[PDB]
Amino acid sequence: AQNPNCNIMIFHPTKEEFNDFDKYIAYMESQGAHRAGLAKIIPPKEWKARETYDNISEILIATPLQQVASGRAGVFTQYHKKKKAMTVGEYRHLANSKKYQTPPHQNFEDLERKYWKNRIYNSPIYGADISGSLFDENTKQWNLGHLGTIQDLLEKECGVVIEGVNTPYLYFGMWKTTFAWHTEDMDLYSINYLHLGEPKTWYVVPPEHGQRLERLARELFPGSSRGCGAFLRHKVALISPTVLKENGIPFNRITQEAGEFMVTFPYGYHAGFNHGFNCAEAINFATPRWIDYGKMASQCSCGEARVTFSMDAFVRILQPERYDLWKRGQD
Ligand SMILES: [Zn+2]
């Protein structure tokens, strides 16, 4: 069995190897990459997403979200308070202001320390789930707007034509911008490209140990667990690496820098934070190996994980018994 310790693996494809997305994902798995639940892919030196990032200031963040925490430093939830619209230009200026700018620090480990010590006492603001792409139309390899669709994958494997179409999303982040512990909708894969700016630190639990994380979360968020059998679908809960370690939860961490891809794997619980102003793009995708994960994915029916019409068909076909209950949760 490849990668038995479930380490996060890092890949350096050549130009040739970067020419077939599906084929390279299969190759990573053949090396045991998926056991970690996350991998890093460094593109070939000659590759670029786009020419420059000089004309992105006019993109609109219709609904910036201020992330307000409740709890204690290492075990907290956050909620999203809606702010007034701002351009990326305005957002960037805000990220860089005294109130929100990255503090001076020694290195990534020093910033991580400061994040977990201090995050709860501040409320950073971010631009989430903005439909769009910063990949140049002419970029042919690993263009996140040019991947095969989950709908076509599902139809190829199962022979059922379904409505829906998934497209990439943009994220604009600042120091302390926080991604709560979660797996992807329907436990899909995800791919995340960091277009520009400061790093993102990721935490990941191996898919084979996902239930250990769920068990701990039930204990640490007892009221949340009571209200919903799949409350991590709400994407509001944070647990520090110190608390994970204290409770024996297997996990790994890695820092993504601008110009790097990260792929998350079916049922890989992940969380993280932004080091400072950045912009990332992400999309879900599927392979034949995802199908069985999609069939077993936990669903929120309490109304607190509203997703989209796009997920309707996946629940409808892969989980007929859960569909009705899920649906009315969506109503
Ligand atoms: Zn719920």
UniProtKB/Swiss-Prot annotation:
Give the UniProt subcellular location, in the record's own words. Answer: Nucleus
Q: What is this enzyme's class at the first EC digit?
A: oxidoreductase
The highest taxon in the source lineage is Eukaryota
Q: Which UniProt keywords apply?
A: ADP-ribosylation, Chromatin regulator, Dioxygenase, Iron, Metal-binding, Nucleus, Oxidoreductase, Transcription, Transcription regulation, Ubl conjugation, Zinc
Does Thylakoid appear among the keywords?
A: no
Cofactor annotation remark: Binds 1 Fe(2+) ion per subunit.
Q: Does the keyword Membrane apply?
A: no
Q: Which GO terms describe its cellular component?
A: blood microparticle; chromatin; nucleoplasm; nucleus; pericentric heterochromatin; site of double-strand break
Query: Can you cite a GO biological process for this protein?
Result: positive regulation of double-strand break repair via nonhomologous end joining
Ranges where the JmjN domain occurs = 8-50
The cofactors named for this UniProt entry are: Fe(2+)
PolyADP-ribosyl glutamic acid-modified residues are where? E16, E17
Modification after translation (UniProt): Ubiquitinated via 'Lys-63'-linked ubiquitin chains. Deubiquitinated by USP14 with the help of TRIM14 leading to stabilization.
The reaction(s) annotated as catalysed by this protein in its Swiss-Prot or TrEMBL entry are: N(6),N(6),N(6)-trimethyl-L-lysyl(9)-[histone H3] + 2 2-oxoglutarate + 2 O2 = N(6)-methyl-L-lysyl(9)-[histone H3] + 2 formaldehyde + 2 succinate + 2 CO2
Q: What is its main location?
A: nucleus
**JmjC domain sequence ranges:** 136-302
Q: Name one GO molecular function term.
A: histone demethylase activity
> Where, in this chain's numbering, is Fe cation bound?
H182, E184, H270
The residues that the entry says bind 2-oxoglutarate are Y126, N192, K200, K235
Enzyme Commission (EC) number:
1.14.11.66
Protein family (similarity comment): Belongs to the JHDM3 histone demethylase family.
Q: What is this protein called?
A: Lysine-specific demethylase 4D
Instruction: Give the organism, scientific name.
Output: Homo sapiens (Human)
- Gene name as annotated: KDM4D
Q: Which residues of the full-length protein are shown here?
A: 11 to 341 of 523
